[PDB]
């Protein structure tokens, strides 16, 4: 390839063809090397020139080459992305969305996706410059299957970045404007379009219940549940994140997930070979057992309590901690008979074994659960029998062991449980 | 008085 | 934690 010095000499020539060849040499440098010399290109002052080339409608080749070069600069660090924005790229790329040449319009889509992907400020600045209307207009066809596959994938990914991040969340009216197109993309059968559409939905559902509501009322939950059962891990991961986000909301929002059949997938989610799936699925379960006692009953009816015993028994510790929360929540909201069923499934022994964990919060979660189970036992006339089970699990004397424990917090029930039940 | 836990 | 892609070839 060319040196940066030669690229600079060609771009400074004021000869449009010499500038085109130098811009192509810059794009090859920026797209071929690993460790492309982005900072050298920026320090040479080339970004304003590339941005001006985006406006040369009489030379579509140099529009494409400079769009590609700027895309890759914008894919770098936040400082490198800011250099592109500072050079006036945002409104120049938005104008290029109207190009008659699909390869040029898609490169502008890509560049705006990298700029928006930097964070909420540049995301919102891309929106303020008017990107959403022309982006959605590229998708306004009766059947998405008539669009080129790579083109559609790039549009979906850029739209997902406009749905990105949390502080703040994207403007409400932008979300409302994008959502119908996003729901179309969620139903499009291409694995990468589905993955990125799912990511967008997971972003939009991560936040307050009002944000969750505007997604749920578009009717997407049954489609998320279908995707929750896909074979592609890049689809299952964001679908599960979105389902998990939705059940952090109200009892009605949680009930839509259950009504759609999500619990039938959890036997495989809670045994999934990928640790991050098990953790995410067990966290979602803990927010479902924090629901109404008829929602707990659905967990029971789907046979999921043995799977929670399993995760509590053997799993990555972070997943085991989420399972302890699931149990405490269950014991906290469940009926006496639901708590009896939990004990009959073998919850006591794995729950006692985790009292040896060096994490302090799981000990407090587990001792809350033990407390909740004893009050159920009290209501039945039945307490002493529970106490017997605990000590044969070794759980008794690793409870006393916890009255030394540093926390005033673990101190409470450690003495409470013994004075009130054991001794 | 929710026991739901955020992400 | 950003989300960006270069175009390679």
UniProtKB/Swiss-Prot annotation, chain A:
The keyword Ribosomal protein does not apply. Heterodimer; with KPNB1. Component of a complex containing CSE1L, RAN and KPNA2. Interacts directly with CSE1L. Interacts with PLAG1. Interacts with APEX1 (via N-terminus). Interacts with FRG1 (via N-terminus). Interacts with ARL4A, CTNNBL1 and NBN. Interacts with ANP32E. Interacts with SNAI1 (via zinc fingers). Interacts with SNAI2 (via zinc fingers). Interacts with BAG6. Interacts with AIFM2; this interaction likely mediates the translocation of AIFM2 into the nucleus upon oxidative stress. Interacts with RSL1D1. Residues 241-329 are annotated as: NLS binding site (minor). It comes from Mus musculus. ARM repeats lie at residues 1-37, 38-77, 78-119, 126-170, 172-208, 209-248, 251-290, 293-335, 336-382, 383-422. One of its GO terms (biological process) is postsynapse to nucleus signaling pathway. The gene is Kpna2. Consists of an N-terminal hydrophilic region, a hydrophobic central region composed of 10 repeats, and a short hydrophilic C-terminus. The N-terminal hydrophilic region contains the importin beta binding domain (IBB domain), which is sufficient for binding importin beta and essential for nuclear protein import. Keywords: Acetylation, Cytoplasm, Nucleus, Phosphoprotein, Protein transport, Repeat, Transport, Ubl conjugation. The keyword Hydrolase does not apply. Functions in nuclear protein import as an adapter protein for nuclear receptor KPNB1. Binds specifically and directly to substrates containing either a simple or bipartite NLS motif. Docking of the importin/substrate complex to the nuclear pore complex (NPC) is mediated by KPNB1 through binding to nucleoporin FxFG repeats and the complex is subsequently translocated through the pore by an energy requiring, Ran-dependent mechanism. This is Importin subunit alpha-1. Slightly detected in brain but not in cerebellum and skeletal muscle, highly expressed in testis and spleen. GO terms for molecular function: DNA-binding transcription factor binding; nuclear import signal receptor activity. Belongs to the importin alpha family. Residues 68-164 are annotated as: NLS binding site (major). The lineage of its organism: Eukaryota, Metazoa, Chordata, Craniata, Vertebrata. GO terms for cellular component: cytoplasmic stress granule; cytosol; glutamatergic synapse; host cell; NLS-dependent protein nuclear import complex; nucleoplasm; postsynaptic density. It comes from the Eukaryota. It is found in: Cytoplasm; Nucleus. Ubiquitinated. Deubiquitinated by USP22; leading to stabilization and increased activity.
